[PDB]
Design an enzyme around this catalytic site. Sequence first.
Site, mmCIF file in Angstrom:
data_model
loop_
_atom_site.group_PDB
_atom_site.id
_atom_site.type_symbol
_atom_site.label_atom_id
_atom_site.label_comp_id
_atom_site.label_asym_id
_atom_site.label_seq_id
_atom_site.Cartn_x
_atom_site.Cartn_y
_atom_site.Cartn_z
ATOM 1 C CB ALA A 169 138.523 12.574 75.735
ATOM 2 N N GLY A 183 139.002 18.002 75.946
ATOM 3 C CA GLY A 183 139.551 19.146 76.687
ATOM 4 C C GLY A 183 138.763 19.736 77.533
ATOM 5 C CB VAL A 184 139.237 21.985 80.111
ATOM 6 C CG1 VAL A 184 138.841 22.863 81.495
ATOM 7 C CG2 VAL A 184 140.491 21.329 80.596
ATOM 8 C CB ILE A 208 131.148 22.763 83.153
ATOM 9 C CG1 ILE A 208 130.391 23.717 83.947
ATOM 10 C CG2 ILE A 208 130.350 21.484 82.828
ATOM 11 C CD1 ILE A 208 130.617 25.131 83.710
ATOM 12 C CG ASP A 226 129.175 9.665 68.107
ATOM 13 O OD1 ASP A 226 128.707 8.530 68.654
ATOM 14 O OD2 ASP A 226 130.001 10.213 68.890
ATOM 15 C CE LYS A 230 135.808 21.758 71.973
ATOM 16 N NZ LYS A 230 134.794 20.714 71.210
HETATM 17 O O1 LIG Z 1 127.658 24.518 77.540
HETATM 18 C C1 LIG Z 1 128.014 23.650 77.438
HETATM 19 N N1 LIG Z 1 128.518 22.595 78.073
HETATM 20 C C2 LIG Z 1 128.023 22.779 79.555
HETATM 21 C C3 LIG Z 1 127.620 21.447 80.207
HETATM 22 C C4 LIG Z 1 127.121 21.601 81.606
HETATM 23 C C5 LIG Z 1 127.100 22.889 82.096
HETATM 24 N N2 LIG Z 1 127.378 23.928 81.731
HETATM 25 C C6 LIG Z 1 128.029 23.889 80.253
HETATM 26 C C7 LIG Z 1 128.640 23.008 75.865
HETATM 27 C C8 LIG Z 1 129.067 22.225 75.407
HETATM 28 C C9 LIG Z 1 129.175 22.269 74.026
HETATM 29 C C10 LIG Z 1 129.575 21.425 72.988
HETATM 30 O O2 LIG Z 1 129.297 21.674 71.826
HETATM 31 C C11 LIG Z 1 130.362 20.091 73.477
HETATM 32 C C12 LIG Z 1 131.683 20.005 74.102
HETATM 33 F F1 LIG Z 1 132.093 21.429 74.446
HETATM 34 C C13 LIG Z 1 132.395 18.894 74.556
HETATM 35 C C14 LIG Z 1 131.798 17.960 74.531
HETATM 36 C C15 LIG Z 1 130.465 17.717 73.535
HETATM 37 C C16 LIG Z 1 129.640 18.797 73.393
HETATM 38 BR BR1 LIG Z 1 128.303 18.540 72.283
HETATM 39 C C17 LIG Z 1 128.910 23.389 73.755
HETATM 40 N N3 LIG Z 1 128.318 24.184 74.800
#
Ligand SMILES: O=C(Nc1cccnc1)c1cc(C(=O)c2c(F)cccc2Br)c[nH]1
EC number: 2.7.11.24
Length: 340
Positions: free
Chosen positions: A12, A14-15, A8, A129, A31
């Site tokens: 910055a 990561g992935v 997805i 933030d 992540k």
């Molecule tokens: O499930 C997530 N992201 C997704 C989006 C869109 C579709 N599928 C999945 C997800 C992201 C997170 C985070 O804490 C998170 C991150 F990893 C990166 C940046 C911001 C934040 Br806030 C937890 N869960």
Amino acid sequence: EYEIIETIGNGAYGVVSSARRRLTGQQVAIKKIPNAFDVVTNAKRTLRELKILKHFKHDNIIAIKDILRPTVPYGEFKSVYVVLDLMESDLHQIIHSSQPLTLEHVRYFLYQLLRGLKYMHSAQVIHRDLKPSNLLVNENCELKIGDFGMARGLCTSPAEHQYFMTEYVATRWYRAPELMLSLHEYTQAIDLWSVGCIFGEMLARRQLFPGKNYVHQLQLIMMVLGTPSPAVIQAVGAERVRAYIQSLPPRQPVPWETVYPGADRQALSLLGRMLRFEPSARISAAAALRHPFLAKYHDPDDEPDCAPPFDFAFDREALTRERIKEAIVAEIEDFHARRE
Ligand SMILES: O=C(Nc1cccnc1)c1cc(C(=O)c2c(F)cccc2Br)c[nH]1
């Protein structure tokens, strides 16, 4: 242990990928923090987030469900994998879309955000933030606060550039006057300003103060709030900012009824309590949950506090990349030791 579904996110941080735990079938987010120990600042941020997330256990705060252990020798361990709650969307995507967002969506979203902040603030954690894109929303409408990279306690290290340069702390459009002006009053009230901006943005489905730069941001806030009081002006760190504010003609605050015409009276009463120049004049997250606007959802017995407070001492230490790597690895070890 995990079957990767699809990739997805990037970058910055990561992935990010969606995945399922092979044994249980449970859907998760994974992540990858690639080359996690290459840069002091980034490594310090990873460590800080891991500890903050391990400390909280709350439905409105993103949780670490797993941290993958090194599968290679210590010296070859270079990238960290964090298993998190799978969250399909975020508040930015909902506000700025063709999806419904009635006064009832606003009320429920606000309730969850404030419920999450009440818990976090009681632990003495200022997120610093908050913005719609950091407010993740799943398919069941559960809102979770994420991205704790900018979070700090009531006391921070003078070794950090940010300690002095408060006006570069976080995102311009949601940045509290105390940070913009260096008012030397940095409390959980920083977050309540951000909440007000988010609340306003949900009501109009557009950003409240979308300043193009530093001065324009100040102008935008003053166009609604009026000129800051002399007590606030005196407290303004820099003379050029202080002089700029004084160079402008007097301005009285504009009623929230004019900014948001025909908006719910109780929504504007609460918004007014959040968006004040003076940090101490702002409503707390706990007192906001007691406001008549959130009466529908408010249950004092279902809105927990966090004991004990979170200690930021580890973050104030001047560690080399290697010492931060050891600290992160010790965090992954503690995570599994607490589970077993
Ligand atoms: O499930 C997530 N992201 C997704 C989006 C869109 C579709 N599928 C999945 C997800 C992201 C997170 C985070 O804490 C998170 C991150 F990893 C990166 C940046 C911001 C934040 Br806030 C937890 N869960």
